[PDB]
Design a protein around this ligand. Structure first.
Ligand SMILES: C[C@@H](C(=O)O)C(=O)SCCNC(=O)CCNC(=O)[C@H](O)C(C)(C)COP(=O)(O)OP(=O)(O)OC[C@H]1O[C@@H](n2cnc3c(N)ncnc32)[C@H](O)[C@@H]1OP(=O)(O)O
Ligand SMILES: C[C@@H](C(=O)O)C(=O)SCCNC(=O)CCNC(=O)[C@H](O)C(C)(C)COP(=O)(O)OP(=O)(O)OC[C@H]1O[C@@H](n2cnc3c(N)ncnc32)[C@H](O)[C@@H]1OP(=O)(O)O
Ligand SMILES: [N+]
Ligand SMILES: [N+]
Lengths: 144, 144
């Protein structure tokens, strides 16, 4: 089952400028940064709070590494803003299979690598009332 | 200070259909429903988790009551999807004054009523890298 909001994915043109905006305005600090070449993003995770399922909630800021990428295409069409939402689960494989069985498009056969070694999948936004929806299992098994 | 993600505001054409989508797909149940005539929305809050600051994180689904409203205009332009993000604080007045002093546009002089008697304000999306950003203090003082 989906037991938390894991993160809000926010697309931006300049990761370093947008990271600084969040730090200066709200005091949010960088929890982690990494590049995901498969996904075509440079990302920064900003931890906002811990959650009742033993996990955490983050802002995931995303700069495209290339124009021909999910985020590069989205930014070109829509400008900076919220790109996706992500829910956490202890068993992304099982929850993705259950959602596939409801006729919602699951974009990956098998979960792929996300931030901090997590295992991720996505649901198609046109099946989710316009919201690109990620399902995430953290690499570190967390304690409710 | 901003101590949690309070909610994700998600605009939809049909609140009851979108509520049912979230229930059927993810098992999320309705925590509360209300109409905010000033804001021009019918809303449903779906609680996803509790947070380390004593608060909670919700999906806030929003149907416009009228076309001439923030959400009615947004839906007409963009279709269904994520409308805003909201951060929680124990002192919305103080945090809004600090952010005003950074040159980010605060849309209200004084916080206004939000869901479940909360006190709310908004930051202009063009000052927040494209994200309409809400600040929320819950009506019930919560215990970290
Ligand atoms: C690394 C990981 C982590 O946790 O670290 C991440 O988050 S990586 C984050 C970046 N990676 C991802 O997003 C991977 C998952 N996304 C994708 O595979 C793609 O972006 C799709 C969702 C398949 C969309 O690709 P597609 O080729 O269809 O592009 P498109 O422009 O033709 O989009 C088709 C329709 O989907 C809509 N659409 C596209 N992206 C959307 C988004 N982010 N939110 C909502 N709607 C979206 C378009 O407006 C269009 O609607 P109309 O019919 O109205 O024109
Ligand atoms: C009840 C409470 C609760 O907690 O219960 C809620 O959440 S109530 C939720 C509903 N209420 C609210 O949202 C109230 C706060 N929002 C507002 O006052 C408004 O929507 C504004 C943010 C002032 C935008 O109004 P405005 O008159 O400027 O409309 P507009 O279409 O001309 O927008 C001007 C520029 O802002 C952009 N823009 C507009 N709405 C946006 C949004 N939700 N996210 C990101 N960007 C947004 C437009 O694309 C445009 O960019 P371009 O320059 O690129 O064209
Ligand atoms: N993500
Ligand atoms: N909201």
């Amino acid at each position: 089952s989906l037991t938390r909001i894991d993160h809000i994915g926010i697309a931006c043109h300049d990761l370093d400028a947008t990271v600084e905006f969040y730090r200066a305005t709200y005091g949010f600090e960088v929890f982690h940064t990494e590049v995901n070449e498969e996904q075509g993003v440079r990302e920064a995770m900003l931890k906002i709070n811990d959650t009742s399922d033993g996990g955490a909630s983050y802002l995931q800021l995303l700069e495209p590494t290339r124009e021909d990428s999910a985020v590069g295409k989205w930014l070109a069409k829509n400008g900076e803003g919220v790109h996706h939402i992500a829910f956490g689960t202890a068993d992304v494989d099982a929850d993705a299979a259950d959602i596939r069985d409801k006729g919602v498009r699951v974009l990956y056969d098998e979960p792929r690598r996300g931030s901090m070694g997590s295992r991720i999948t996505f649901l198609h936004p046109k099946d989710c009332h316009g919201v690109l929806t990620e399902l995430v299992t953290s690499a570190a098994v967390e304690s409710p």
